[PDB]
Design a binder for this molecule. Structure first.
Ligand SMILES: C[C@H]1CCC[C@H](C[C@H]2Cc3cc(O)cc(O)c3C(=O)O2)O1
Ligand SMILES: C[C@H]1CCC[C@H](C[C@H]2Cc3cc(O)cc(O)c3C(=O)O2)O1
Ligand SMILES: N[C@@H](CCCC[NH3+])C(=O)O
Ligand SMILES: N[C@@H](CCCC[NH3+])C(=O)O
Lengths: 484, 486
């Protein structure tokens, strides 16, 4: 263990003393492992192309029992593997002693090979080296397959080398974001970048990160959302605009919460709640189909040990009104204002009666949220669904519902009880922005005329979790935030 | 003045009291203004399509009347403009008094218009309103084009700059086109985009004061990344042989025409590539990028501002390479012997600075003295064409691999446009033993010990690049919301 590293450390030094460079600068390779497999997978068993010289690189992930002049290795690159069949007959003895050269090779070593393509008699696609150079050695002992804990998160490179599902998961993540970008781009949307650091931190309910700028001698807040600046751009005449980037929220960590996570928000001039619902249904249905050739996926809601559930992404999705639903599953009528002494105490009695835990503070919005979490947000697990028409007290930036007083034109989409999407008709009457009478800069922009707008936010990481069958957000983030 | 705002606000309340919503929820439009223009630009003079009804929205930018029966407006949307020609005879009198309705409209007002397309007698493409409704009023007096440029207003109220200045939209459209081109450029070449952490327990790899922040639940101080180099290399170790990231990095340093505390960088790492592959890539990219945008490899750039003479910048490859140490020796007619770390060579450089009246880097480390030299004697060598400064000394380049024939040096390359660095690339140091700073955190070092293949890496200053290709002299001009003092 500690000895292995010391030996390899010595070996590197010993090689240098012998004038050999264990870390050469440039090895010009002529073909990639995936390319190699594609161009030679259909060779006949035992067939050799001994005249076709190739330069190929990879990482040795398996060394076979040294035979009498016959050495076998597994070589991996870009998530694919071919066999290394070193044969004494084909060895270039000008470059060095056969057995001595390959006896040096250890598992994990990155090597560059000069050889020709062919299959073994058994029909295994292989590269036959005439020469093998060491490009970069592995000084530690790699875990065996199925051998790899918190190591996955702290040493992600080891996860990517050993666990095949790892590369697939993060490839899917990029495919997801790519798809999202093209989806918004194909429909006339314009991607921008707003500031990570601001004098204030809206628009969402979350404790911010605070940092300090030295030469300006200024205390800056890390953005918790992108909503405000993007809406100012709508005012600026960018009628379809969006941003895919990191946002920072200074709260608790768990399976669905990571301090910094990727979000996408777009704002869509002259669109509304109804446009937004249709968009959501269009996007998720098409996205899931694009990844799986079907609108149905399997997801292990209760973990890999328990039976998975099926999630049907076939549109349309159910819409559930938050207040009405709570009233219906409670046989109660929550009379407005929701923050009245009568209604608050009535919500509290529901929370005590049903054995639910009381929020703190016991504000109207907090109570409504807790009631929703218990009586609604798990109503459907077999398909996405929207909770809609949130009260204004929960939605300080959502435009008032056009027929339901006290409510707003807002929609959250849930997958297996987890919020992945938040959208509403943007409040654009500056007079109704009670806080403005938020950021001064934002408030002022409204006064110049925000047209009728629809805004939407996506939780990218959580969406990745569901489409990569993960129970934790740590599985869809390359370098999640870990306690040291 | 302020009386205008207060009157407008009062107007808003008065409309609310008379039973009308000055902020309606939804106006279902059927066509956009640019679509409108593209679909009827080839109409004939005086022609109408009076049975083709359209819903169209936009912002009123001009208001001219002619006898209380003809009202004229400029309607803009998506950076384009058409005329609004309101005629009493075409007006739908069931929706309200003609003169009254249009008397209420002010410059900046966003409106929804039900009407038909046509051209004026003079050939001005126009929407002919049968009905016009307020969607959202502008409560303030919108400045004219001379009320903005040039002030801080463009940087604090970017929305005003975007509405009134046509070039501003063009500028930020270009920025996005550039990032798109880069993403496609790398993606087409098999590169894999990823996201590495904004916050870490340490902050490498680069030479800059970091931002410091605190995580409350972990009870932990964290550093905003100054670069993305370390995590990406670790991913190379993970077998992601072509990886990259386009995002913000944070450097707590000084603010000027080429420095913003947060800025957008692109760093990629390319397994089994080296210094020469990097030079080729840089040349392929900038030439193709420039040509993609301009159909030519040559562009004009106002180095001294729009008031003074512009210069031409030829992005036709190849570009000049200049060895930093050898070049400094030539121009100063001195011989900087190694190690550069030595007191003797430090004394030489300090004297050259004294002799030439260059500001001393406090503190004057060898690396900073070298940089200050190259800055004063080399970095402005070429302005009419981009060029590389190469083969930086190892003491300037702790993560760059050593030069394979020139001792003390490394296989590194910085590219310059008008004396401003836009690119920093080099062959990566992959021998854990030669990274004596390991014997950056232990996470990165441990990873090198698992075998980093020979690799080339490169970093792009996206903002600065956007500056030169949008003809701007300040980075504040290519950032939507630049960092300002409150
Ligand atoms: C941008 C928003 C829209 C609603 C869904 C989703 C919620 C968001 C909240 C959130 C808070 C937090 O502290 C940590 C996190 O990882 C998340 C997240 O992933 O998802 O993204
Ligand atoms: C990623 C790097 C590679 C080299 C060029 C360029 C340099 C980088 C340095 C830098 C430092 C700083 O404090 C503020 C800034 O705005 C920049 C910048 O734009 O450019 O980008
Ligand atoms: N910024 C919101 C998402 C957009 C909601 C619609 N303006 C959030 O972080 O939840
Ligand atoms: N991290 C470097 C760019 C990459 C250099 C090559 N590894 C910088 O901030 O300039």
């Amino acid at each position: 263990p500690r000895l292995y590293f010391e030996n390899r450390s010595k070996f590197i030094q010993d090689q240098k003393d012998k004038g050999i460079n264990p870390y050469p600068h440039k090895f010009e390779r002529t073909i990639s492992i995936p390319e190699f497999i594609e161009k030679y997978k259909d060779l006949g068993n035992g067939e050799h192309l001994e005249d076709t010289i190739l330069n190929i690189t990879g990482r040795i992930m398996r060394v076979s029992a040294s035979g009498q002049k016959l050495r076998f290795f597994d070589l991996v690159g870009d998530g694919e593997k071919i066999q290394v069949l070193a044969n004494y007959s084909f060895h270039n003895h000008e470059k060095g002693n056969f057995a001595e050269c390959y006896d040096k090779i250890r598992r994990g070593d990155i090597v560059g090979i000069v050889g020709f393509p062919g299959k073994s008699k058994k029909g295994e696609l292989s590269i036959f080296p005439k020469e093998t150079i060491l490009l970069s050695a592995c000084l530690h002992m790699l875990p065996m397959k199925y051998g790899l804990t918190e190591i996955r998160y702290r040493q992600r490179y080891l996860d990517l080398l050993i666990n095949e599902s790892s590369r697939h998961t993060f490839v899917t993540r990029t495919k997801i974001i790519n798809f999202l970008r093209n989806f918004l781009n194909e429909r006339g949307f314009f991607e921008v970048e707003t500031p990570m650091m601001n004098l204030i931190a809206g628009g969402a309910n979350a404790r911010p990160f605070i940092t300090h700028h030295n030469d300006l001698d200024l205390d800056l807040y890390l953005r918790i959302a992108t909503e405000l600046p993007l809406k100012m751009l709508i005012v600026g005449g960018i009628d379809k605009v969006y941003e895919i980037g990191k946002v920072f929220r200074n709260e608790g960590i768990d399976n669905t919460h990571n301090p910094e996570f990727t979000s996408c928000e777009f704002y869509w001039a002259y669109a509304d709640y109804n446009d937004l619902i249709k968009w959501s249904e269009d996007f998720f249905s098409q996205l899931v189909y694009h990844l799986f050739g079907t609108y149905k996926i399997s997801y292990n809601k209760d973990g890999p040990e328990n039976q998975p559930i099926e999630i049907d992404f076939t549109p349309p999705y159910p819409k559930v009104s938050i207040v009405e639903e709570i009233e219906k599953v409670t046989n109660t009528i929550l009379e407005q204002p929701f923050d009245s002494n009568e209604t608050i105490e009535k919500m509290i009695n529901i929370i005590k009666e049903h054995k639910i835990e009381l929020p703190n503070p016991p504000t109207a919005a907090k109570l409504l949220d807790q009631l929703a979490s218990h009586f609604i947000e798990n109503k459907y697990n077999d398909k996405p669904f929207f909770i809609v028409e949130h009260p204004q007290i929960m939605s300080p930036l959502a435009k008032y519902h056009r027929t339901k007083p006290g409510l707003t034109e807002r929609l959250e989409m849930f997958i297996c009880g987890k919020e992945v999407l938040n959208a509403y008709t943007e409040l654009n009457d500056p007079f109704k922005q009670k806080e403005c009478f938020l950021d001064s800069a934002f408030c002022t922009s409204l006064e110049y005329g925000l047209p009728p707008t629809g805004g939407l936010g996506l939780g990218i990481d959580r969406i990745t979790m569901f489409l990569t069958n993960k129970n934790s957000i740590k599985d869809v983030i390359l370098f999640p935030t870990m306690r040291p």
